[PDB]
Write an enzyme that holds these catalytic residues in place. Structure first.
Site, PDB file in Angstrom:
ATOM      1  N   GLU B  44      34.410  18.708   8.198  1.00  0.00           N
ATOM      2  CA  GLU B  44      33.641  17.857   9.094  1.00  0.00           C
ATOM      3  C   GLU B  44      32.428  17.254   8.391  1.00  0.00           C
ATOM      4  OE1 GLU B  44      32.030  19.862  12.461  1.00  0.00           O
ATOM      5  OE2 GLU B  44      31.455  18.027  13.516  1.00  0.00           O
ATOM      6  N   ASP B 109      19.635  28.915   1.411  1.00  0.00           N
ATOM      7  CA  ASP B 109      18.464  28.060   1.320  1.00  0.00           C
ATOM      8  C   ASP B 109      17.239  28.943   1.166  1.00  0.00           C
ATOM      9  OD1 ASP B 109      16.464  26.109   1.489  1.00  0.00           O
ATOM     10  OD2 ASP B 109      17.574  24.951   2.980  1.00  0.00           O
ATOM     11  N   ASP B 111      12.818  28.482   0.965  1.00  0.00           N
ATOM     12  CA  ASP B 111      11.745  27.527   1.202  1.00  0.00           C
ATOM     13  C   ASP B 111      10.538  27.837   0.327  1.00  0.00           C
ATOM     14  OD1 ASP B 111       9.734  25.814   2.191  1.00  0.00           O
ATOM     15  OD2 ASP B 111      10.579  25.846   4.204  1.00  0.00           O
TER      16      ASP B 111
END
Ligand SMILES: [Zn+2]
Lengths: 141, 386
Positions: B44, B109, B111
């Site tokens: 997708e 991920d 930060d």
């Protein structure tokens, strides 16, 4: 027959065939069958007058959405189908159409102390709501 | 760190979608040689145009019409999305409640806002080389983690451009493991557990985990340099007052005693170590341990993990080399071969790569170098394919 005295609480005099010739030979008991039929229809009305069949069935059909003239005649398919379709065709589906428990071994034995009766009125609609089942919502195969 | 004018972005994407995207290499990298049927079509995408109108249910059969539509719309934010159980763009055909997400590439991920508990160099939108020392060091540990104790070799690394860095790994079957395994590995790497609420964020128990051993061996080579060179964290009351308030108290005055008789920030930590040699982490036995001091060091530079992005199968993240409009910077491939030579300030923005090409393909500018990492991973994939 039994209902004559359960709700209606009176007598039901009945006459078989072999006395019909007696009443052919009779004016008191023949007229008596006539007034008996009078009272028969009367009690028949009193049935409605007490059980309130008319407005009950009326309101039902009103909420049902189907021909009352086919309601009294007896049916559970009508008073479910022609109701559900109301909503289901506000939801732009297309439906098919017409064509052609557990016992618990009652432990018999007299009981002396008080006994209570629990009713599970509204059990199936209850469970269905409780667990959100609906045609669209099951991989049914 | 941000972008300064959305005026150029329309034409920039206009040209980028046209002749600045590895549609060949991308179609490949996703479909994976088409070894599986209905593999790509359900893989997708989510697209986001002006006013950030992000929308799911986006996919195209092969590279050609993929391109054609990408250039027809030019979305301004693009998330790759897991191959859900069926046709994304025709989701509402089958019975409801029967469309879900089966298999997803494993995402990570980290930060820079993570380090903000002590980060005093720059702001939540602005950076400097100091904080970037972390973007140079932390990745090393996380990378070699999967490189030595997770049996994978399909790793790929990118820095988002504003705050985070990404890792979209498509290991042999991990792409197809349960959310439970996701949460598992997350729990595994979640060592220093601290945001802005708890202080003693690391109750490291007695015996070490050799993982932590290699972690330490990385720490004593890359933390103290940045700390006492690029920050000298013992510079004024402010910084060390964000420090001493996680410590036992028997000696908690000697540290400040060393704080305010100073001309550097070295003998302070030295006498810290010294009194620790006479301090008792264990009143019972003679194992004077670096528990607290190294908790300090690590917690001051450690990759703070996300608890919901590295397990869920719904959070979708950016595409390779899809622009970050709010930095100019686009997805920069990051490698161990480059961790020793990266700088965030010099690597280019969409504006800068545009001015680069505003002068045939990525085969001319530094974009062919930048996608050398891309096509290198792809080469490995070719080797992954039997
Ligand atoms: Zn700074």
């Amino acid at each position: 027959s039994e209902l004559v005295q359960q709700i209606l609480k009176t007598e039901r005099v009945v006459i078989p065939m072999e006395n019909i010739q007696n009443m052919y030979s009779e004016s008191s008991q023949l007229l008596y069958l006539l007034e008996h039929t009078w009272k028969d229809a009367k009690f028949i009305l009193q049935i409605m007058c007490e059980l309130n069949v008319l407005p009950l069935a009326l309101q039902i059909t009103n909420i049902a959405g189907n021909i009352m003239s086919r309601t009294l005649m007896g049916g559970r398919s009508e008073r479910n189908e022609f109701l559900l379709l109301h909503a289901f065709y506000e939801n732009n589906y297309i439906v098919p159409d017409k064509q052609i428990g557990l016992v618990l071994d009652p432990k018999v034995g007299f009981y002396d102390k008080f006994i209570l009766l629990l009713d599970f009125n509204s059990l199936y609609p209850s469970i269905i709501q409780e667990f959100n089942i609906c045609f669209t919502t099951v991989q049914r195969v | 760190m941000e972008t300064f004018d959305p005026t150029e972005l329309p034409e920039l994407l206009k040209l980028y979608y046209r002749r600045l995207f590895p549609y060949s290499q991308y179609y490949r990298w996703l479909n994976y040689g088409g070894v599986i049927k209905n593999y790509f079509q359900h893989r997708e995408f989510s697209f986001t145009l002006k006013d950030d109108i992000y929308i799911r249910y986006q996919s195209f059969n092969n590279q050609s019409d993929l391109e054609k539509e990408m250039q027809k719309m030019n979305p301004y934010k693009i998330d790759i999305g897991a191959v859900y159980s069926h046709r994304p763009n025709q989701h509402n055909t089958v019975k409801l409640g029967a469309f879900q997400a089966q298999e997803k590439e494993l995402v990570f991920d980290i930060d820079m806002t993570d380090y903000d508990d002590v980060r005093r160099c720059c702001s939540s939108a602005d950076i400097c080389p100091k904080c970037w020392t972390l973007m140079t060091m932390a990745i090393r540990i996380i990378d070699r983690a999967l490189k030595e104790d997770f049996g994978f070799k399909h790793r790929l690394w990118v820095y988002s451009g504003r705050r985070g860095v990404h890792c979209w790994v498509c290991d042999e079957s991990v792409r197809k493991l349960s959310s439970a395994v996701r949460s598992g590995i997350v729990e595994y790497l979640s060592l220093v557990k601290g945001g802005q609420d708890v202080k003693k964020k690391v109750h490291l128990s007695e015996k070490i985990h050799p993982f932590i051993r290699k972690s330490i061996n990385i720490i004593k080579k890359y933390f103290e340099e940045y700390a006492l060179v690029n920050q000298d964290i013992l510079e004024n009351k402010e910084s060390w007052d964000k420090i001493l308030a996680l410590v036992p108290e028997t000696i908690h005055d000697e540290l400040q005693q060393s704080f305010q008789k100073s001309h550097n920030s070295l003998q302070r930590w030295e006498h810290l170590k010294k009194v620790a040699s006479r301090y008792q982490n264990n009143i019972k036995n003679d194992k004077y341990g670096p528990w607290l001091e190294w908790e300090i060091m690590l917690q001051y530079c450690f990759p703070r993990l996300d608890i919901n992005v590295s397990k869920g199968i719904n959070h979708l993240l950016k595409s390779p080399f899809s622009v970050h409009p709010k930095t100019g910077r686009i997805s920069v491939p990051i490698d161990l071969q480059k961790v020793d030579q990266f700088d965030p300030f010099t690597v280019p923005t969409i504006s800068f790569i545009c001015r680069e090409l505003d002068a045939r393909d990525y085969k001319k500018t530094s974009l062919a170098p930048y996608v050398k990492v891309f096509e290198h991973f792809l080469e490995n994939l070719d080797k992954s394919r039997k």
